[PDB]
A paper describes a structure:
In the oxidoreductase pathway, two enzymes, xylose reductase (XR) and xylitol dehydrogenase (XDH), are used to convert D-xylose to D-xylulose using xylitol as an intermediate, and XR/XDH enzymes derived from Scherrsomyces stipitis (SsXR, SsXDH, respectively) have been introduced into S. cerevisiae and Y. lipolytica for D-xylose intake. Aldo-keto reductases (AKRs), which include D-xylose reductase, are found in almost all organisms, and has broad substrate specificity for sugars, lipid aldehydes, ketosteroids, ketoprostaglandins, and chemical carcinogens as substrates. The overall structure of SsXR is similar to that of the AKR superfamily enzymes. The monomeric structure of SsXR consists of a core domain and two auxiliary regions (ARs), AR-I and AR-II.
The residues Phe216, Gln219, Glu223, Phe236, Ala253, Lys270, Asn272, Arg276, Glu279, and Asn280 contribute to formation of the nucleotide binding pocket. The adenine ring is stabilized by Glu279 and Asn280 and the 2′-phosphate group of NADPH is stabilized by Gln219, Asn272, and Arg276 through hydrogen bonds. In the NADPH-bound form, the α9 helix and α9-α10 connecting loop (Gly217-Ser232) were in the closed conformation without crystal contact, and the Gln219 and Glu223 residues form hydrogen bonds with the phosphate atom of the phosphoribose moiety.
Numbering used by the authors: 2 to 318
Write the structure that this text describes.
Amino acid sequence: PSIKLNSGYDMPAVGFGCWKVDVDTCSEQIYRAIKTGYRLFDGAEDYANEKLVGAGVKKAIDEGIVKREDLFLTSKLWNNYHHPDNVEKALNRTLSDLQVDYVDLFLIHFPVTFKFVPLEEKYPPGFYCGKGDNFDYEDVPILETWKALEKLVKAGKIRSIGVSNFPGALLLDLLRGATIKPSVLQVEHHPYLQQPRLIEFAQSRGIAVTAYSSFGPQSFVELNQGRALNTSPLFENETIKAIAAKHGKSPAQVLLRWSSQRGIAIIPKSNTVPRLLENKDVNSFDLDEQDFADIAKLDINLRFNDPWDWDKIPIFV
Ligand SMILES: NC(=O)c1ccc[n+]([C@@H]2O[C@H](COP(=O)([O-])OP(=O)(O)OC[C@H]3O[C@@H](n4cnc5c(N)ncnc54)[C@H](OP(=O)(O)O)[C@@H]3O)[C@@H](O)[C@H]2O)c1
């Protein structure tokens, strides 16, 4: 099952999330997921594993299990790299780590502009902005970054371009300046942060929405985030359990189906082989209108991935 992007390419509707994949088994896991049937891999410069991902894919291509053209590789431009002189440096490093000639989707990871740090100096940079333990920022409007991305599509290094973690007003302004329109909007999306109007906006413009953190706080419990600890797991939620029992499906299948059935692409992080199988078809069943209505009541605007936490960066205020 596939989503036709406005660029003309098809994006697999269910993918494999590469954030915080155990580093010692990362290449094996990618290979294994490809062999299990996953065709989209959601990666990023910031996840620090693009070499590992690229070896997984190398192996599966060499052993004949898949062709390059059957895979959909996503990556994301990190925040130090928005200046138009530096966009291509970061993309070239992603292409070399992945060992490919083009990437299928290249996203602006965040509408946040860290001071550039040369790649030989520190890669990937994280929060380092070339000034000690201090944040430092540069004045590069989004549209400058976007125009640099558009040249990289024209040069055949990227097929489709998009954005991650953009609010509505910012996306709307980007649409006014874009020649190639954004193909994808990738945002945090689970029942505790539903943002229904944002999704409605993006879909009405023909922009495919990718949900991340479909399991909500669970991904952030790994990092000991205070907010995530302190949140009741979605898996134990009384409504999610009623709905699971009603359809004979697991909580996790209900949480993923809630998005996939609304045409929203999913990219769950799938650590074990049964999870790999379970997460790859939740499209075995339909939620009904009463189900959506009961899940809609869980929305509390609880956001786990917020740059306000990093440095009071006002992306979501
Ligand atoms: N800013 C961005 O654009 C951004 C930010 C975050 C994520 N992402 C992307 O979206 C992807 C997915 O989001 P995520 O990594 O936050 O986590 P997620 O997919 O919400 O949650 C992953 C966690 O759920 C548990 N899990 C997975 N499948 C399960 C199942 N079938 N049953 C029960 N538990 C299950 C695992 O927890 P345990 O192993 O702890 O049991 C795993 O750590 C990322 O990997 C990344 O590619 C993008």
